[PDB]
Amino acid sequence: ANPNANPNANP
Amino acid sequence: XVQLXXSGGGXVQXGXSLXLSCXAXXXXXXXXXXXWXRQXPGXXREXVXXXXXXXXXXXXXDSXXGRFTXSXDXXXXXXXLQXXXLXXXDXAXYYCXXXXXXXXXXXXXXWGXGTXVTVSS
Amino acid sequence: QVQLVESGGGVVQPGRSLRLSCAASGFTFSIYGMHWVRQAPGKGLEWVALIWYDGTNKYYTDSVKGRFTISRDNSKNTLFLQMNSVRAEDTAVYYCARDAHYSDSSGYSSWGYFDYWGQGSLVTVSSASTKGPSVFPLAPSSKSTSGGTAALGCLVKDYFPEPVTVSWNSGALTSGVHTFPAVLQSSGLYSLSSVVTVPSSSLGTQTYICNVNHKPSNTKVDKRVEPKSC
Amino acid sequence: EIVLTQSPATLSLSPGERATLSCRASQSVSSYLAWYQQKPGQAPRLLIFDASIRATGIPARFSGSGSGTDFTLTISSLEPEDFAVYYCQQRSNWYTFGQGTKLEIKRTVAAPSVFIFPPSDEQLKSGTASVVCLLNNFYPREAKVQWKVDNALQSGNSQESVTEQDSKDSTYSLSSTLTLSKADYEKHKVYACEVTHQGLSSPVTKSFNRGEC
């Protein structure tokens, strides 16, 4: 898993 | 270890311009701030200006802001005080000193011999 | 409208736990990832933890992983930081921050920056007990005279936690006052001084009193500052 | 772990002038860089993100440029509300910040006035002696304080505190506090603090003799 993935709704 | 030799002073009319020089020998001064002071007859030595290392700026006394400018020629181990719009009250012996503290706390260990500037018509 | 209001800070002993809250208003809380960032006294910013909008994925900086837990309650628009097994090095102002989600008309999308922040909550990790300051005069003399101006003050020593406040002459003297930031001593207690400059001719005439308040210990002290002959 | 290094540590400028702030990353962060402003006691404020995109509500005088490892924040005409600390931050690999650059107000040189205070009799009766040296209303910030007790230079037994630039005159003030046991204090006579600053041609010393105050 990527700690810098988008953490907000609807990427 | 280091010697400071000043030049450029002399007699100038009110409103005129001069440039003082302070040439250092014996040690390289590019890493150190260099300051100008002046002492009028009977008074204490007053701060005039400081040229820090290139990129670190110049700072000035209230009495000379806007009229005097410091600059450096590191390749020639020399600093300068450009003096414009001179007034009789600027008459004094002008001194240069090296700040031996590279962190700029004003450890003035070596001083030039002084050069007289007289502003009179 | 965007607001983040934090609560829950204070003093916590080493090894214990403290929970911070961040109440959000003025935006759709449940669509935003949320972060905690902290700032130790006198130092820079350090990212602490992140939680996805839906509470699933959570990430932590190495020095808190396994000790702190991030959570959220979307129905109450609140973000939490549960700090466990705390250590002195966790002392800091803790900010919550919203993930700066951004998009444009062409499908560009950004995130991973901090666009709105709480006001900060100070967490002080210490074993020290609540204690008011001892207040001592800094007396004026000729060794504290420069020209026709003298300086005097009060040393406000050995208190915990912050803060103290200092006034002079019950608030009548404000010009020339400098009250320094506290320093943490090796003892774990704080100390500071407050000074003021005044006309030297006033030393024989004018009464100078510093008024010190330390609310956590209900300490109130007036100290008269009288001249000396140094 | 990506390390961001900011330069210079302090920039001393006047309103109207252009301010140029630098941030260098230890390895490439592509364009995933932001700039923040922070004033004392307040939360940071996002100015620029993705290296060059201005955040909503940020004045046009702020601009960001760069990519890879070298980034610049420029303020084309500084205004009074811009004096603050500025940080950069990356989100290419985890989340790290630079150490900050302080943008301070320049003014003319003012040497500190120097004052020394002896410990009070009240404090002495209790076991400790604090001796305080005050450097008042000076600029620029750099200064050195040395304590001497019977002419012997002290080390390790003093702590300094400094104010923020004064709102009206833009100067700093600084205290240095020497802490000794009462027993040690009572072994010596002359207590001196020696101050240097670029506005002082010679160091300024203030001293007292124990028990003559």
Side-chain angles (χ1 to χ4, degrees), chain C residues 25-105:
Chain C
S25 68
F27 65 107
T28 305
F29 181 72
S30 63
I31 65 175
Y32 281 89
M34 292 298 296
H35 299 261
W36 287 97
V37 179
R38 68 187 177 181
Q39 180 164 37
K43 307 301 176 62
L45 298 162
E46 185 189 25
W47 176 85
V48 175
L50 158 67
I51 182 164
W52 281 26
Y53 67 100
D54 61 4
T56 54
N57 290 324
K58 304 170 189 63
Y59 297 102
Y60 301 97
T61 194
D62 291 353
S63 65
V64 311
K65 200 181 174 190
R67 294 190 301 120
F68 291 11
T69 295
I70 190 173
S71 56
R72 64 197 298 155
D73 181 351
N74 285 343
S75 69
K76 300 180 179 175
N77 302 296
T78 305
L79 173 74
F80 299 103
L81 186 64
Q82 182 64 60
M83 302 170 68
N84 301 306
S85 302
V86 296
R87 306 182 51 86
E89 44 254 50
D90 293 326
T91 291
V93 172
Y94 281 76
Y95 294 102
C96 54
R98 187 178 85 161
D99 193 272
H101 177 212
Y102 168 79
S103 72
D104 72 356
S105 182

Side-chain angles (χ1 to χ4, degrees), chain D residues 65-143:
Chain D
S65 53
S67 69
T69 58
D70 306 310
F71 299 85
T72 305
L73 178 70
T74 300
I75 310 177
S76 60
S77 291
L78 279 164
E79 306 299 338
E81 64 264 40
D82 301 338
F83 295 106
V85 175
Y86 291 82
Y87 295 98
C88 54
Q89 178 241 322
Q90 60 87 26
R91 60 89 170 192
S92 179
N93 184 270
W94 293 83
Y95 307 90
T96 61
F97 292 91
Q99 83 274 17
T101 289
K102 183 183 183 169
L103 180 38
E104 70 162 22
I105 302 153
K106 201 171 180 169
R107 60 152 285 154
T108 57
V109 175
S113 297
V114 178
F115 305 88
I116 195 172
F117 303 102
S120 73
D121 287 340
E122 189 182 4
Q123 186 187 23
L124 288 173
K125 191 183 175 70
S126 66
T128 299
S130 299
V131 197
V132 176
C133 188
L134 169 61
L135 282 59
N136 211 40
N137 295 352
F138 61 93
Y139 187 83
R141 165 68 181 83
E142 293 84 4

